[PDB]
Amino acid sequence: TTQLIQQVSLTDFFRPDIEHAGSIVLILRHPSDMIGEANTLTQAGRDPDVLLEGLRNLFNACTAPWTVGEGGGLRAYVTSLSFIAACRAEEYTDKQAADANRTAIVSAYGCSRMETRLIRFSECLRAMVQCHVFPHRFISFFGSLLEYTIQDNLCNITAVAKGPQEAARTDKTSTRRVTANIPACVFWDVDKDLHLSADGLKHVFLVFVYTQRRQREGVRLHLALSQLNEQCFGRGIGFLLGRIRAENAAWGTEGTRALPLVQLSNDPTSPRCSIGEITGVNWNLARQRLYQWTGDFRGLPTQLSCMYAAYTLIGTIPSESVRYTRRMERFGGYNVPTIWLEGVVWGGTNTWNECYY
């Protein structure tokens, strides 16, 4: 009834040893595509190679740094949700839960070359949202972790693709069943902000809030759980994010007379330009003036410079009146508040809807 996906990768961003069974795991595209997209989509005036500076130092502080460029299949493919949650923990509203998860992921990992890795990833995302290379097209989604096998610094993991959560058999734990586990920092239900009844079926989304200013950019990651419709979620999110939308509309771009067309077309006795001269023999004295309009529009907010969020459907919960449970348990050698979701069917294609308003 369910399907599985296997993949081997480097363990510098993901550790299937400490991560609990049932957590979310994401994958990354090849970093070589970032520069090919940045040098062509960077806003006019901005420096396009600050991303390259921010990116090179990331792998300089990562094992096997001489293996970038060929993509033979031995790169850091997958990553964990808690990793990004800890990298951007200074931006979530739940101060204590954020910093607790941060120190926990620092201690449980190598804890020697981990803090440097985190700050490199932090400004890496900061430079990612500096040239309109938004990190919602480079971060895909995998199902919850089910089984793993590791020998040293290289792991083979398998996760569910789509279907019921407790329809698999992990077959090495105490029980043969697992449930979805998430850090309490990313969880954010919108219906209890929008003040509507929470009964019935609810969808799951991931959002990527963007802040665009001068030398100050921010990117969070929230796992929203709402009963709102497939497309109506966009109109719902704008009501809560109305501030950042207006901030971006004014601080997004930092790098002329009208014409009365309908007026002079409603009235006659205007200079006409019949097709007889556009045939193409002397098409300069025919169009000598005909108008001037002195018109040009170069610097204006595009629909891409005012974007502030991008969501995507992941799964639903058919059981009405969900009863998600939040509690603190040990994660390595530290306790972190995790929320436990039961009976969630994965599915849905990876299509991102961008909320630019």
Binding site: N39, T40, L41, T42, A44, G45, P48, S197, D199, G200, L201, Q227, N229, E230, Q231, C232, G255, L259, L261, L264, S265, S270, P271, R272, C273, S274, I275, I278, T279, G280, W283, R287, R289, L290, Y291, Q292, W293, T294, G295, D296, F297, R298, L300, T302, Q303, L304, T316, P318, E320, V345, G347, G348, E354, Y356, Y357
Partner: protein
């Protein structure tokens, strides 16, 4: 397979039960999905916004928010129905045609309120409510109806030819809260389709008019259009500016791409989205109004 059970009210008259048995493969809507529900949700009384029956522009917004369901075999006591929106396998699904227009194979189905003559709908006197079933047309007919309704809305603040037959629409706009909302979402799409690259595409009007002649095909493109045909012989269009960083940037790329996503969002936010695809096995190629077809979930 997910289904919802509508408990019919007791003490129903025998005439209404037979009329309810006529509605075998129609579509109903729900505000909140649940296995067990009541008849009040399906009733039009649930569509009320302030205190009154809804509007055709308010109905278009209730259709997006509400969940969709399909009626199936009804028994004297219960009323079975299956869900559509949420991903759930349903073998052998079928819909009854309610629109006056015919359908054929491979047509996408939309959902719009009754804009034609008074909607045929079951009325219950003893219970005191009535249920109105939505109307289902193909995609092509859907986009034409929305275009004329929105244009009439701007007029306040019609004939459609399909298969060589003309129809009319009696649009209802007795409210004002919803009419101005459609104006907002409209201009916001036009405003986000303006980038630095319009200037180049706005400078290619004269060569377009030249290409209009001795082509025999662009003329039809020119006749339907009005602005470019009028501006083509009335404005000068100052020649050209330069590019800030032309050594590594492509300015006409965004505009040709920024518009692609905008146009795709236009057809859905303005009205509704495609819900179903009709594909009948071992059946007629064209269905007539009142008959049923086997359709596939989108």
């Amino acid at each position: 397979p997910f289904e919802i059970e509508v408990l019919l009210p007791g003490e129903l008259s025998p005439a209404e039960t037979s009329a309810l048995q006529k509605c075998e493969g129609k579509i109903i809507t729900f505000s909140t999905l649940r296995h067990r529900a009541s008849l009040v949700d399906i009733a039009l009384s649930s569509y009320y916004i302030n205190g009154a029956p809804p509007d055709t522009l308010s109905l278009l917004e209730a259709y997006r928010m509400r969940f969709a369901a399909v009626i199936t075999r009804v028994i004297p006591g219960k009323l079975l129905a299956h869900a559509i929106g949420v991903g759930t396998p349903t073998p052998g699904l079928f819909i009854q045609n309610t629109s006056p227009v015919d359908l054929c194979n491979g047509d996408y189905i939309c959902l719009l309120p009754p804009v034609f003559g008074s909607a045929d709908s079951i009325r219950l006197d003893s219970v005191g409510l009535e249920i109105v079933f939505p109307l289902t047309i193909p995609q092509t007919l859907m986009r034409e109806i929305i275009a004329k309704v929105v244009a009439r809305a701007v007029e306040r603040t019609d004939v459609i030819c399909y298969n060589g037959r003309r129809y009319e629409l009696e649009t209802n706009l007795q409210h004002r809260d919803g009419s101005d909302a459609a104006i907002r979402t409209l201009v916001l799409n036009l405003m986000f389709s303006i980038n630095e690259g319009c200037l180049l595409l706005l400078a290619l009007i004269p060569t377009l008019l030249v290409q209009g002649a001795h082509d025999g095909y662009v003329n039809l493109l020119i006749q339907t259009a009005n602005c470019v045909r009028e501006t083509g012989q009335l404005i000068n269009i100052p020649p050209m500016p330069r590019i800030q960083d032309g050594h590594r940037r492509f300015p006409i790329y965004e505009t040709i791409s920024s518009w692609i996503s905008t146009s795709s969002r236009l057809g859905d936010t303005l009205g509704t989205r495609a819900i179903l695809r009709v594909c009948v096995f071992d059946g007629p190629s064209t269905v007539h109004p009142g008959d049923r077809t086997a359709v596939i979930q989108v």
